[model samples]
Target: MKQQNFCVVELLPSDPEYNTVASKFNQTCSHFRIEKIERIQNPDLWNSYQAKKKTMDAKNGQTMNEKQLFHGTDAGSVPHVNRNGFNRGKGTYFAVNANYSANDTYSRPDANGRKHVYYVRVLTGIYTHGNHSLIVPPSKNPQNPTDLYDTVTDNVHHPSLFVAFYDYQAYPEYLITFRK
Candidate 1:
């Protein structure tokens, strides 16, 4: 049987997962107060990410890195992300610091003053520093042009920002709604 394309489950205050997510958000961006947190479940997206990560690990002969990141969007865009995934931009941008994603420029408020941020699981395997002109990740080795890095970042050693060219590189795991 085919699984559902997407499922959103509202996390109650008592849920351990909810507390963990909420705590992380509050600790990272203390200026905003969380209203709710919803877990996103997309089996297809999860499977594709797993496949990509496994291939990357095999190529590197080690476990590829993964990170829990944040992506901010307006309220209207939330449904689009839930149904078709994050395909609206040239490259999907994610932030290591919650405050960066929580900025008003990205997390614009709706009519009711509620802003939204996505807590994502990103496969940042074999990343390298990136510039604005990059359409895809740079080649890991000049001798092997076909073998490329899996992700790109603002800083190689301590990344504050990350960009993934492929849609399958990330999974929108949770949605956090808040207000200042």
Candidate 2:
């Protein structure tokens, strides 16, 4: 992959994309008021994610499942995440509900009382129910150890939380700034 710098472009209120993100946040979490939405223009990251998706699709012999999810974090970590991407030993967790990620436990406010949450595109692919004890996803086939699941979640039927082990499985599409 070719190296390329990512840029953050602020979306104005008039922009349709901004309204889409704002409405999604408000619908899920009414406590916070959206201040701004910034689109992350990271070609390299997006390309990597797409590549991974294609590979998974081929491996699964079908289209992989993808979703728009949320990842909350402190303002200080935003820049680092944008540049280096998420790296968690256990796996990076993403939430289907905006409120879940917007909580104080994950999206802690800065000194200015502003919280940052990422609206990301995540590739769930083939998944199974997960537990805290899991270091990586379980094998899809017990007989074939190499055929591991692509992701793990809290519930296989109706997943509210999804955990991805690989960094390229997700791409931060937008940064939403809000306040209580």
Candidate 3:
């Protein structure tokens, strides 16, 4: 009868209570087969690592020859973004880095076919309570796709983190693509 307006909210990642939630999120990722989950040190390094990966792939005839996919993807280019109590409210901020292979599921034909995969270096500032824990729906465009503050905001559910991506390549809303 009516299109619902989803109210989104998020917590700060720097909060002490955030540690437990972060741990849980990490465990969830592990269980879901989400790979390359790491902390962002030098943001730019993340960018450079990707650039080098591209170069390597191009040189090697469009296939990654490296023993490790993330070998060169953690170097730089991950621009530093500042966050406050803007998106729902101020809370603990923890930028979670990870990659989801389409190959893991039958629906992700692109990754399953080895044509592309999703590399999500998402910014999720967690707090004591939680709401938005799973993938960002394809229909939602939280704005400032590059800004973590905009991506991860609101908590209409429980633990909500508006997700802004580092290098969002595809799927429009939440997922960013990387060629395989």
Candidate 4:
């Protein structure tokens, strides 16, 4: 019976071999992921795209309005976080831009109007490896809640650029939130 501390490494696109290292990275990482992204030329596109997605989700009845959605909620934030677990690191663990520095404030909850948070957090193990994924149990509240990255697009048609995200295993020594 021992506690552990794990090392964390955050990589960016500008880093050398960042792409290669990221690709080889196991999806089981509970914290970060490597994603392919194209710098956006227009910001408005992103917002419009989300509107469309919301529409689609609504059409299929899987939309946020269809269910009881919140302004900011990851799987961990979900009331049922512990009972339901993720498999193979699938599903939306966090909001699309939650990981990006610019998006730090993006997932923050808002009650300004009729808007609803995407509730995209997939509640992952924070680790991923090919078909193998991990599910981290909630220990403490998150260091940062959703939506603190930046101001949201409102009344304006701003654009978006998707940055793919992935998760990796906690350093072997660390007793991460992940469960067996």
Which candidate tops TM-score?
2
lDDT at 54, model 2: 82
TM-score of 3: 0.21
Candidate 2 overall Cα lDDT vs. reference?
A: 0.86
Full-model lDDT for every candidate: 0.85, 0.86, 0.29, 0.25
TM-score of 2: 0.93
lDDT of 2 by residue, 1-180 (tens): 466469999999999999898877887887788888999988888888889888877777765568888999999899877865675455898999999999989999999899999998898888999888888889988899988888899998899999988868888889999999
Worst 10-residue lDDT window for candidate 3 reads 68-77
Write model 4 residue lDDT over 3-35, tens digit each, in one string: 212222333568564444333222223254323
Name the candidate, 1 or 3, with the larger TM-score value: 1
Arrange candidates by lDDT, highest first: which order? 2, 1, 3, 4
Off by over 4 Å in 1: 1-4
Q: How close to the true structure is residue 144 of candidate 3, measured as C-alpha lDDT?
A: 46
Backbone clashes in candidate 3 total 39
Model with the higher lDDT, candidate 2 or 4: 2
Top-scoring candidate (lDDT): 2
- Give the per-residue lDDT of model 3 (tens digit) for 23-102: 54344243343222223233233444356445545644643222211111211212111111112233322222323222
Ranking by TM-score: 2, 1, 3, 4
Clashing pairs in 2: none
Task: Give per-candidate clash totals.
Answer: 0, 0, 39, 43
